[PDB]
């Protein structure tokens, strides 16, 4: 359009994402080794 | 906007806040993640000779979101701020970087 002139289910899922990230990191570290 | 009665013409919203719908008693707050630039957004000037308003021009009807690589953390803002070094803005309209 060319512009002008110039809670309980959120952290419980973010911790799950940050735990799946750690699981992926451990999985990657266990394969290269 | 028109926050009072007996008004011969309603004032155009000041640049920061904008309005979209019809007949709005108050301006709508420009939520963080956008901006509202407009020049001719000046409430009409009642001349003392005939007590009649004139020269009213409407403000920005649309939210007109903040383009890519440009954010706005603070609401009720006319201009859009560039995202800082080290952080990215992936899509237009991002509240923060």
């Amino acid at each position: 359009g060319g512009g002008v002139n110039q809670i309980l289910s959120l952290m419980e899922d973010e911790d799950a994402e940050a735990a799946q990230e750690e699981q992926a990191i451990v999985d990657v570290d266990a394969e290269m080794q | 906007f028109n926050d009072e009665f007996s008004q011969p013409v309603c004032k155009a919203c000041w640049s920061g806040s904008f309005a979209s719908k019809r007949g709005l008693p108050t301006c709508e707050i420009a939520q963080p993640g956008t901006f509202t630039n407009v020049a001719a957004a000046a409430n009409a000037t009642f001349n003392t000779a005939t007590l009649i308003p004139t020269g009213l021009v409407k403000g920005a009807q649309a939210p007109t979101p903040c383009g890519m690589g440009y954010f706005q953390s603070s609401a009720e803002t006319t201009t859009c701020t560039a995202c800082a070094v080290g952080t990215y803005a992936d899509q237009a309209g991002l509240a923060a970087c």
Side-chain angles (χ1 to χ4, degrees), chain A residues 1-3 7-33, chain B:
Chain A
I7 296 172
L8 293 170
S9 189
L10 288 175
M11 81 189 78
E12 279 184 23
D13 294 359
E14 273 184 23
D15 287 17
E17 189 181 339
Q20 289 173 26
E21 185 203 309
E22 197 162 26
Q23 179 62 28
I25 289 160
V26 167
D27 288 344
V28 162
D29 189 37
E31 281 181 346
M32 291 325 88
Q33 291 177 358
Chain B
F1 57 120
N2 184 48
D3 64 312
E4 60 282 85
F5 302 62
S6 154
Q7 267 271 349
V9 73
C10 43
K11 312 189 218 299
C13 290
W14 64 67
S15 176
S17 51
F18 80 99
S20 61
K21 301 294 186 70
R22 216 146 298 159
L24 287 167
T26 179
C27 304
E28 172 296 345
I29 175 143
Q31 296 188 60
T34 181
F35 71 120
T36 45
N37 201 339
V38 64
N43 324 297
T45 167
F46 294 73
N47 75 88
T48 324
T50 49
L51 294 170
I52 201 173
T54 174
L56 188 71
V57 180
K58 82 175 189 172
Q61 63 164 310
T64 198
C66 262
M68 259 204 288
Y70 271 95
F71 82 109
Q72 190 56 253
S73 174
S74 53
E76 281 200 327
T77 41
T78 296
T79 57
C80 197
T81 59
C83 265
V85 65
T87 180
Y88 72 101
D90 182 54
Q91 323 94 320
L94 272 185
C97 308

